[PDB]
Amino acid sequence: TNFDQEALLYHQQGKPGKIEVISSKPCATEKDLSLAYSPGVAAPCKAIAKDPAKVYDYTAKGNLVAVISNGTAVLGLGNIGPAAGKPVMEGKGILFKQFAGIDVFDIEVAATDVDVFCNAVRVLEPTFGGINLEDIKAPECFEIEERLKKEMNIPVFHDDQHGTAIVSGAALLNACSITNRKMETVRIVVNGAGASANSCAKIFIALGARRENIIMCDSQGVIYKGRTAGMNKYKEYFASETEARTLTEALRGADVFVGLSVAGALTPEMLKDMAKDPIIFAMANPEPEITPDKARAARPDAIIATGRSDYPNQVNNVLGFPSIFRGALDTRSTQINEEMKLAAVHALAKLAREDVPDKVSATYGGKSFKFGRDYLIPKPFDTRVLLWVAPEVAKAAMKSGVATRA
Amino acid sequence: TTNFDQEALLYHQQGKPGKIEVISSKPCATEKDLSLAYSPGVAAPCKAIAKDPAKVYDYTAKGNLVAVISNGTAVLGLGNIGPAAGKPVMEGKGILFKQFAGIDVFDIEVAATDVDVFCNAVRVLEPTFGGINLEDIKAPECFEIEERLKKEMNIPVFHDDQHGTAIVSGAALLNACSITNRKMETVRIVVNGAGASANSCAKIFIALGARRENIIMCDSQGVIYKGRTAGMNKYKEYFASETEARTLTEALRGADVFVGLSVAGALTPEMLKDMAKDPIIFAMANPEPEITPDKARAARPDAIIATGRSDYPNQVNNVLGFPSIFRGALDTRSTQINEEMKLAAVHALAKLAREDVPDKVSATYGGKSFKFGRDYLIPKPFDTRVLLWVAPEVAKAAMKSGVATRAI
Ligand SMILES: [Mg+2]
Ligand SMILES: [Mg+2]
Numbered sequence: 145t146n147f148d149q150e151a152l153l154y155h156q157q158g159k160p161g162k163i164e165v166i167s168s169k170p171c172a173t174e175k176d177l178s179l180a181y182s183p184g185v186a187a188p189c190k191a192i193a194k195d196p197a198k199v200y201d202y203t204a205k206g207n208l209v210a211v212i213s214n215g216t217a218v219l220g221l222g223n224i225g226p227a228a229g230k231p232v233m234e235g236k237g238i239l240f241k242q243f244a245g246i247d248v249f250d251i252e253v254a255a256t257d258v259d260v261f262c263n264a265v266r267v268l269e270p271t272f273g274g275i276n277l278e279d280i281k282a283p284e285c286f287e288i289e290e291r292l293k294k295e296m297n298i299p300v301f302h303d304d305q306h307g308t309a310i311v312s313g314a315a316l317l318n319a320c321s322i323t324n325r326k327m328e329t330v331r332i333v334v335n336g337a338g339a340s341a342n343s344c345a346k347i348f349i350a351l352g353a354r355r356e357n358i359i360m361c362d363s364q365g366v367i368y369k370g371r372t373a374g375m376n377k378y379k380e381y382f383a384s385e386t387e388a389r390t391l392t393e394a395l396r397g398a399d400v401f402v403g404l405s406v407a408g409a410l411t412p413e414m415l416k417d418m419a420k421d422p423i424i425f426a427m428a429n430p431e432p433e434i435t436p437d438k439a440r441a442a443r444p445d446a447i448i449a450t451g452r453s454d455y456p457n458q459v460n461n462v463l464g465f466p467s468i469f470r471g472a473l474d475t476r477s478t479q480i481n482e483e484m485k486l487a488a489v490h491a492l493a494k495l496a497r498e499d500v501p502d503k504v505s506a507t508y509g510g511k512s513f514k515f516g517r518d519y520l521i522p523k524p525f526d527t528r529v530l531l532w533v534a535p536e537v538a539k540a541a542m543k544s545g546v547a548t549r550a
Numbered sequence: 551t552t553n554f555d556q557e558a559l560l561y562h563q564q565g566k567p568g569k570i571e572v573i574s575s576k577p578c579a580t581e582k583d584l585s586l587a588y589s590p591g592v593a594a595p596c597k598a599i600a601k602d603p604a605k606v607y608d609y610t611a612k613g614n615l616v617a618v619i620s621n622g623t624a625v626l627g628l629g630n631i632g633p634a635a636g637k638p639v640m641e642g643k644g645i646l647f648k649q650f651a652g653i654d655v656f657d658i659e660v661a662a663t664d665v666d667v668f669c670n671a672v673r674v675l676e677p678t679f680g681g682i683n684l685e686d687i688k689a690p691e692c693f694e695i696e697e698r699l700k701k702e703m704n705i706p707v708f709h710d711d712q713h714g715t716a717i718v719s720g721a722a723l724l725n726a727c728s729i730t731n732r733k734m735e736t737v738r739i740v741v742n743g744a745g746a747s748a749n750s751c752a753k754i755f756i757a758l759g760a761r762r763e764n765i766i767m768c769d770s771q772g773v774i775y776k777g778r779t780a781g782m783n784k785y786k787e788y789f790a791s792e793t794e795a796r797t798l799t800e801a802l803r804g805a806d807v808f809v810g811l812s813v814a815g816a817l818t819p820e821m822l823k824d825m826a827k828d829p830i831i832f833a834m835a836n837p838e839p840e841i842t843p844d845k846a847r848a849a850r851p852d853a854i855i856a857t858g859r860s861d862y863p864n865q866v867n868n869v870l871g872f873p874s875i876f877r878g879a880l881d882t883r884s885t886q887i888n889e890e891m892k893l894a895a896v897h898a899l900a901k902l903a904r905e906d907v908p909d910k911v912s913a914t915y916g917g918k919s920f921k922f923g924r925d926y927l928i929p930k931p932f933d934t935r936v937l938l939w940v941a942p943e944v945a946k947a948a949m950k951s952g953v954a955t956r957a958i
Contacts, residue, residue: 151591152598152609159575161611162587165654168571169561171645174860174932180569181642183837184558186626191559193628193635202559203637204568215677219593221600226677228599230610235588238578247572249656252677264671270622270633270659430590453581525581 155231162234163250168204197548199270200476204247209469210272211236212251214261217281217304217339220429226252229279236278236303244466244530246473248276258287266295273473274299274480276465282339286378299472299480302339307461308404309343310468310485311521312425313351314492315449315457316400318520323421323447325399327352331419333394335433336404337362337379344402345382350486359384359394366394399423407431412442424448427459447517453524460524464488467530471537475547487540491533495522562638569641570657575611604955606677607883611654616681616876618643619658619672624688624711624746627836633659636686643685643710651873651937653880655683665691669698676703680880681887683872684709689746690785706879706887709746714868715811716750717875717892719832720758721899722856722866722927723807728904729924730828730854732806734759738826740801742840743811744769744786751809752789757893766791766801773801806830810840817841819849827852834858834866854924863925870899870929874937878944882954894947898940902929910934 155161170176178184188202200206215229230252237248251268255261261284265275275298277289285302292300320327330353334341337360345358360367360382364374369383388394395401395414400423403409410426410433424439424446426432432450439446449457468488472480500513504526513519522529541547562568577583585591595609607613622636623629637659644655656679662668668691672682682705684696696709727734737760741748744767752765767774767789771781776790795801802808802821807830810817817833817840829850833839836858843855843862856864875895879887907920911933920926929936948954 147591148594151586151594154576154586154591155595155609159611160608160613162574162576162578163611163654164573164575165644165648165656166571166573167569167645167648168566169564169569171569171649177646177649178860179558179561180645181639182626184554184561185638185642186628187555187558188562188638189625189628189631189635192637193631196634199634199637201567202562203641204566204570205634205637206567218596219589221593221596224596224600227603227606227612228596230599230606230612230677231592231595232588234610235592237572238574238587239584241572241574242578242584247570249572249658250678251656251675254674254677260670260674263667264674267660267662267667267671268658270637270661271657 162231162238200273200549205271205273206473206476207245208247208249208272209240209274209276209473210251210268211240211248211276211278212253212265213277213279214253214255215279216256216284218279223281226254232279236276239462240276240466240469243462244470244534246466246469256284258284258291261288262291262295266292269296269298272298273476274469275301276469277302278304280304283376283378285339293479297478299469299477301465301468301480303461303465304339306340306343306485307464308340308427308459309347310464310488311459311461311492312344312402312427312449313347313489314496315425315459315520316348316423317351317489317493318496318515319423319447322517322520323423328354330357330399331397332358332400332402333391333398334358334360334402334404335391335409337367338404341404342378342382344404347485347489350482351489355382356385358382359386359388361391361394365390401425401433403427403433405433407433410434410439415439415442415446418443421445421447425450425459427451447520449520456518457520458524459521462524463492463522463529467491467533468537470530470534472541474534474549475538475541476549477541477546478548479546481541481544481546483544484537484540487536488533491536492521492529495526495528495532496520498528501528569638569645607680612678612680613880613883614652615654615656615679616647616683616880617658617675617679618647618655618683618685619660620684620686621660621662621668622686623663623691625686630688633661639686643683646869647683647873647876650869651877651941653873653876663691665694665698669695669702672699673702676705679705680883681706681876682708683876685711687711690783692746693785700886704885706876706884708872708875708887710868710872711746712750713747713892714871715747715834715866716754717871717895718866718868718899718928719751719809719834719856720754720896721870721903722832722864723755723830724758724896724900725903725922725927726807726830726854729927730830735761737764737807738805739765739807739809740768740798740805741765741809741811742768742798742816744774745811748811749785749788751811754892754896757889758896762789763791765789766793766795766805768798768801772797808832808840810834812840814838814840819845822846822849822853825850829853831855832857832866854927856927860931864927865931866928867931869931870936871895871940874898874940875944877937877941879948881941881956882945882948882958883956884948884953885955886953888948888951888953890947890951891944894943895940898943899928899936902933902935902939903927908935
């Protein structure tokens with residue numbers, strides 16, 4: 145592939161890799177360095193020793209996020225290990241900087257055991273304003289995030305778990321609005337039991353969907369209570385009463401399909417029997433469960449969102465984590481909690497309803513967007529997102545009492 | 551001067567809090583740019599590294615990235631203030647790496663005082679970094695931690711507080727001996743102070759040709775003599791001496807070299823008066839030297855003095871060591887910084903000071919004249935020749951000793 149070669153050269157050329165650490169202050173003279181280092185640097189140390197909160201005033205902590213991975217689930221490459229994941233973590237860090245102005249240290253950790261990983265990461269707390277866990281396989285990632293959120297007094301957030309849920313939650317909110325639907329009666333079917341599956345269900349319920357209206361499926365079919373095969377602690381929580389056992393049966397009359405599976409997992413027949421104006425999230429990648437065209441060919445009333453920037457309504461994680469961490473950092477929050485995640489969902493949804501500015505159109509080739517079936521969420525390169533979402537997260541942090549700065 | 555304290559606080563909070571920023575070294579504005587820096591293009595270097603682990607040095611910042619890691623248990627001269635309070639110092643250390651060797655640094659402050667917790671945490675960070683500079687960890691824990699991490703990790707691990715003073719003072723000593731026509735094997739050295747850098751000084755001096763029988767270590771309790779128990783440990787005894795002397799005053803009679811790692815005033819004119827002809831004094835107490843060059847010259851006109859102060863000639867400044875040492879180790883993709891490499895740095899620093907000083911250096915220092923002798927025993931910190939002289943010799947020592955994985 146010529147594109148793979150372009151990517152290798154991109155990384156290899158010039159300064160190897162994609163990041164550089166620079167000084168934000170003058171550091172060229174004896175005088176400069178008498179402040180940046182000994183003896184002047186003793187002064188902020190002594191201030192922080194006396195008043196711990198001042199670490200946020202004299203260091204980069206308040207704008208510094210760790211992107212931390214053990215490389216056990218890198219993109220779609222699987223368990224390739226910490227060093228091979230480093231380009232991805234450097235790149236995630238680039239997204240933080242470009243979209244939120246947040247500085248990132250990417251940390252690749254050679255630990256696969258949950259408790260070993262956690263015991264190594266938790267003692268890094270003094271360094272960072274927040275932790276973005278990335279590309280850790282399930283189920284370890286559930287246990288790791290849960291334990292670090294309890295042990296650490298700074299935000300801990302696994303974006304692979306929650307980003308899809310937050311952004312698709314906002315799209316689902318708008319899709320329901322457009323089709324005169326109330327969340328408490330919407331029937332949702334989730335296909336796939338990966339890292340982001342459960343979080344989708346939790347966010348949808350937080351948006352007012354009912355637990356009984358959600359059916360989760362995996363490779364073996366419907367996850368029903370009593371099922372034992374392929375089961376575990378996490379699949380068990382959202383296990384359903386439904387008499388359905390296959391995805392085909394679960395989808396009959398369903399309103400929403402959340403696809404976190406493989407291409408072709410959604411067929412015209414399943415589509416045939418969904419409720420009118422079906423809402424389809426085809427998040428499998430590289431290839432969606434079904435293309436927008438093949439979907440509308442079978443059901444012209446179908447509303448569709450995918451993980452791809454080729455098609456309308458791209459569910460892109462970059463719409464979530466930059467603003468969420470920006471709001472958390474700005475309030476020096478000790479957590480990113482469900483209230484802050486929900487605030488991001490509603491803000492994203494509300495932004496899509498606004499008029500789309502000229503330069504957004506300009507950015508996307510003169511294409512005109514207006515709120516509807518073809519425009520349910522903001523575009524990823526819409527610069528309004530940070531301005532719209534981060535303050536709502538900040539407000540939610542203050543309201544829920546996890547903010548430590550007004 | 552608490553108004554100088556004020557200047558430093560302002561410096562740290564002006565514009566952006568802190569002293570560091572992380573930026574992209576490549577285009578990252580457009581969707582096309584980001585299709586290379588992130589999904590899907592970023593999969594290509596990932597797959598290459600998975601097939602061949604060494605390619606992590608080709609496609610990431612690892613080969614120019616050092617961690618400055620501390621638990622804040624011995625920050626500068628402030629003692630055990632903890633990891634958050636040490637963060638400005640570690641950010642500052644990283645600034646020195648970048649300005650003097652072009653090395654990128656992630657400063658990592660670790661909330662762990664238990665040796666096992668600390669080492670377990672740092673060991674598994676190897677995939678991230680090309681090298682580890684331990685900093686501001688108190689003794690004796692720092693000894694256990696550095697030895698363990700050097701053994702356990704396959705990237706260089708180096709505790710600059712232990713070794714920097716030793717390397718730079720060793721270079722100065724070599725040159726001081728040259729000037730006074732001494733042979734290292736017969737030089738009598740007294741080390742005053744038993745902190746993190748004391749033993750490493752003794753080891754480097756012996757590597758330079760000094761003898762144990764000629765070295766006497768002192769502390770709070772006076773001389774550390776063999777057979778002493780009072781306030782001893784597994785590190786103090788390693789250099790205990792058969793001397794009949796018990797106080798610092800006694801130790802210094804007829805001695806050639808005083809190595810001061812203690813407190814101000816610890817060296818008085820009386821004991822200076824009874825040192826050998828051409829006494830060599832390293833007064834490296836922070837912030838005020840055991841004695842100033844001027845009062846040392848008063849008590850003893852034939853005295854040769856180095857201090858930790860940029861104020862006085864012959865500054866024993868750690869910045870002469872670690873930037874080049876890591877530069878040499880990184881560029882050869884070495885698995886260690888070993889004693890051979892440390893020695894190579896010593897000899898390179900010493901040799902550089904013997905050369906004619908270029909106009910460029912004089913101009914940097916306001917037009918002052920420098921020539922090898924009693925007032926110029928080691929290179930100036932802002933001499934750009936230092937990296938050019940030291941890093942290649944470190945690299946050659948890495949290759950010669952077999953720890954390099956990449957030839958230069
Ligand atoms: Mg990921
Ligand atoms: Mg230090």
